[PDB]
């Protein structure tokens, strides 16, 4: 007794019809009647072959309340049949989650009608659609009238055998490109290829358009997405009797993972940013868990949030990456073993995981993107130290050593594929004086412009160097001193006892970072170097590969001391108090390869609108076509925030590319490291570590205007 569901990886959509799940014809996936409710099941195949489920129910604007209730019931009971491991989403028309919208990049059509009105999914047609949206394109069915028209939008007059695409004079070219997807969708999916699509603009309306609409009058402009200030703060509550009562458990993110308890379920309030999460404990009694959706709705009312607020319901052990990022260092029991983690985001579920191999890196942009390496780091490079307001060439014998009282500029030529490119690294010491740091940024930008405005520009801060920057010095480790200086003047002497953290990247290169000499700075994944007046300790953590201890050894040579190698837990006590005694220090191993699972890359459009900084998430798989030439985009790799600069965006947004990327970082509710590197990228000159993230990158994509292409490519 059932309906054929669960199945294999794919997408299944039902329309809730008189308390019954009714399959939508697959060629109409994306069409929704505003008067009905739907249930949607996305099945994702994990890398280990297992199946992971996302259950969404979708409420139309004019949808019922009992019908909405049925959709809520079916979402709950389908999850019951899937043994409670799906994550549930309540999606309202016009404010659906990014995860939901990624299932349809032909757009969404919102149809007039519903079950009660007596309408089905199944030609004699006469509809009109208003198409709004850049990243998330939505086609709202509107009254067939000239009064529905706005000159800032594009409209689709559907006449069955003929489809008329009408684009207002005040509509930007990118919006017209997204509107062609809807017109093609109606042609290829509703009429299955047999329909003409006719494109036109203001003043070139065909006789058919004017025969149903009448003569065209003057038309008004259009009136109808994440302010950055609302992203940051969130709170965590514990529910009781979902007589619904909640108690504040944490008032400021990041939250302690220990705050979550298995016997209860919690609400993570992010409502000022438009979403709340319901985290179900695995030992919460089933009355509470089956009533999670009502508990979330009651919370929306109790806090006067908009009823369109996105609601997510997560089972314990299956929390999404966006949920876990609200927590200080979320660590699973499953973490270091296995193939993935609790969740695998739909938009990367089909990304082949390429291990690093320097010999073949020049042939795989995928490897470049996934490891943050544009090449093996063996090309021509000039290094400058900023003294006053000028670039001063650094002694080549000292290449790889960097002093915290300086800021440097690295010009590097990278080769990947059969193409050469340049990267300008702007390293800023944590103790470099503000004027020279600010001078290094200006001279960096100046160096870019004199080199054609084409080189990659990557702002780096001491202690958080990108993986590619470490690998620039042969087999020698990048050595990073705490607040010295290497200029001709004050060649000042070192401290008595120094400490050095020696970390390696996936390419084998290392960096030796001087840190405060205490036990709390130690780390079991890395080798360490402790130099005292007396001797020299070479400490090796239990997770330290041989590639780290070799790099730590070449550092003990430039320090001119012979080591005494000391394994973690096998420490002589002269070592133990040279730090001031023993204390706790980080031992949980790093994500290494699961970073992409725990922090998948995300694409955003940003904008410095008059007064407020706004970011819009780009849902679905990352596509080159999503990069509008008149936009400044952000590709949030975890270790590094790319900022792609469209060639046709305003000069204001172009020069603000650096700070807009940092306003994005500092407002991130994960409380991202403020030292996180930023990497400005120019349109048409993107590095492999950027393009390798994209399905189908065309090296000649922008040679022809994408809109001129689209009207040609069948329209
Ligand atoms: Cl059954
Ligand atoms: Cl069923
Ligand atoms: Cl949205
Ligand atoms: Cl990888
Ligand atoms: Cl290139
Ligand atoms: Cl990093």
Curated annotation (Swiss-Prot):
One Pfam match, given by its short name, reads Gelsolin
| Chain positions found as N6-acetyllysine | 518
Concerning SMART domains, the annotation shows: GEL
Query: Which stretches does the entry tag as region Actin-binding, Ca-sensitive?
Result: 368-715
Q: In which tissues is it expressed?
A: Phagocytic cells, platelets, fibroblasts, nonmuscle cells, smooth and skeletal muscle cells.
The protein's GO terms of the molecular function aspect are:
actin binding; actin filament binding; calcium ion binding; myosin II binding; phosphatidylinositol 3-kinase catalytic subunit binding; phosphatidylinositol-4,5-bisphosphate binding
What does the PTM comment of the record read? Phosphorylation on Tyr-29, Tyr-343, Tyr-399, Tyr-537 and Tyr-585 in vitro is induced in presence of phospholipids.
Describe the family membership recorded for this protein in Swiss-Prot or TrEMBL: Belongs to the villin/gelsolin family.
* Comment field on protein domains: Comprises six structurally related gelsolin-like (G1-G6) domains, that, in a calcium-free environment, are packed together to form a compact globular structure in which the putative actin-binding sequences are not sufficiently exposed to enable binding to occur. Binding calcium may release the connections that join the N- and C-terminal halves of gelsolin, enabling each half to bind actin relatively independently. G1 and G4 bind two Ca(2+) in a type I and in a type II manner. G2, G3, G5 and G6 bind only one Ca(2+) in a type II manner.
Q: What is this protein called?
A: Gelsolin
